[PDB]
Design a binder for this molecule. Structure first.
Ligand SMILES: Nc1ncnc2c1ncn2[C@@H]1O[C@H](COP(=O)(O)OP(=O)(O)NP(=O)(O)O)[C@@H](O)[C@H]1O
Ligand SMILES: Nc1ncnc2c1ncn2[C@@H]1O[C@H](COP(=O)(O)OP(=O)(O)NP(=O)(O)O)[C@@H](O)[C@H]1O
Ligand SMILES: [Mg+2]
Ligand SMILES: [Mg+2]
Lengths: 236, 237
């Protein structure tokens, strides 16, 4: 009776806080659960470099795979693209475990204010673009439909959620390069902004630069594309 | 630049391993070295509670992360590494990939260890730190492969530029190369620490339990059965 819980939701929506609260209640019910997410490995490097992301991603999948043989796993990650949620569901599929996607939502104004209170580590402008561009889960594939959609500005009943997940766990389980380029150019942009401490007008400019660059890319070799993106930001 | 190296920390709780790791990782990265800091607490602290049955998973997961990382990055192993068997296991990972390694032994006076502990809410009982201090075998006491590359006094300022220089020099060199008792010693200590913390034992109950453990370990001298019995003993007591 092991299940895979897949969080999804934009930066600052409260994934990690929700993960820790849910884990506490599950363990109260004598469920063995582990919270795993890419930041565990990413933040173990003293700096960020794009070449680290492959190791970060694989390491995170490996831990989840190993963990899910013996424990419930809560995947604490933005999981912005359907391709990521697919990779995770395929881990559950490998071991015939049930899974539940839990989509955490909040308005853009809430995410911005939360970002501001945590020291605006990711740029506000970047959260705004992510918000505009986000394809909400379940809008394409039936396997991607959320088990729960949770408004994190309203009271959340963790006992009820726990009850529902343990019920689900007893049920019979039923079952991109463009994404990488999109994901890493965004991270590169955020890092440059933070590194070079760009002003608000410069921030708008580089976010717009990225948008234009990606239109050109679309209308590919990832490493060449990302290297050129870096060179472009430097040039600009 | 050139080569990859495994850096193995060792030292008692509160000595400053995690702080040292972050400072060292920063100076290595400043020199364009790709380095990652990995320790068993990454995985241990991802569970909402501690249970002894998690530890084998925690151990194996951590070794697998270290193994996978060392293929591409310097790795700083941020763990107490209280037993020489642990330092052996880590060295065998370096050996498997023919990578240099360096044990860095961090030290401080019992005095300072306790003050630091206290300064963090006594997350581990002071009495337990004391007992670890007494029973600790310093690296290199027995095997030459176990000898510290550096011994750092954390009671004093640390020259990280000097340390980075020495490690980088080491990394260009040509590399040269029961635990059931450790497991029981280790988990009974953790169980004791957990009981003290969760039943808020007073100072005197703490001493009895610490002594209870040593007596127990003398009598016992497979791990699951023995550990279940130890828990039963503490409950009974
Ligand atoms: N349910 C909630 N209600 C109010 N505030 C919250 C809630 N959840 C999280 N927060 C606050 O929002 C901020 C971000 O929360 P966190 O749990 O770190 O979000 P996250 O989605 O995990 N962020 P990230 O890891 O960067 O994508 C923190 O400062 C929290 O205190
Ligand atoms: N060199 C130092 N000088 C003064 N204080 C220090 C030093 N190193 C660490 N500390 C402080 O001591 C406390 C414990 O440091 P930490 O780096 O967590 O130790 P640790 O060895 O990693 N502990 P643990 O993970 O429990 O084995 C922290 O509050 C530090 O700020
Ligand atoms: Mg988070
Ligand atoms: Mg530490």
């Amino acid at each position: 009776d092991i299940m895979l819980i897949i969080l999804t939701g934009l930066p600052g929506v409260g994934k990690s806080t929700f993960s820790k609260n849910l884990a506490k209640i599950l363990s109260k019910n004598n469920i063995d659960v582990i919270v795993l997410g890419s930041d565990l490995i990413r933040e173990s490097f003293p700096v960020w470099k794009e070449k680290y992301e492959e190791f970060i991603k694989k390491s995170t999948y490996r831990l989840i795979d190993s963990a899910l043989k013996n424990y419930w796993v809560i995947v604490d990650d933005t999981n912005y693209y359907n391709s990521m949620r697919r990779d995770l569901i395929n881990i559950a599929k490998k071991y015939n475990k049930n899974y539940a996607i839990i989509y955490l939502k909040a308005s853009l104004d809430v995410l911005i204010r939360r970002n501001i209170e945590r020291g605006e580590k990711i740029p506000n402008e970047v959260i705004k673009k992510m918000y505009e561009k986000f394809d909400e889960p379940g809008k394409k594939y039936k396997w991607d439909e959320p088990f729960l959609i949770i408004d994190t500005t309203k009271d959340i009943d963790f006992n009820e959620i726990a009850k529902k997940l343990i019920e689900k766990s007893k049920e019979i389980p039923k079952f991109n390069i463009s994404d990488k380029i999109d994901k890493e150019t965004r991270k590169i942009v955020s890092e440059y902004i933070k590194s070079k401490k760009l002003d608000k007008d410069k921030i708008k400019e580089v976010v717009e630069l990225r948008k234009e660059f990606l239109k050109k890319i679309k209308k590919v070799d990832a490493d060449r594309v990302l290297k050129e993106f870096k060179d472009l930001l430097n040039s600009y």
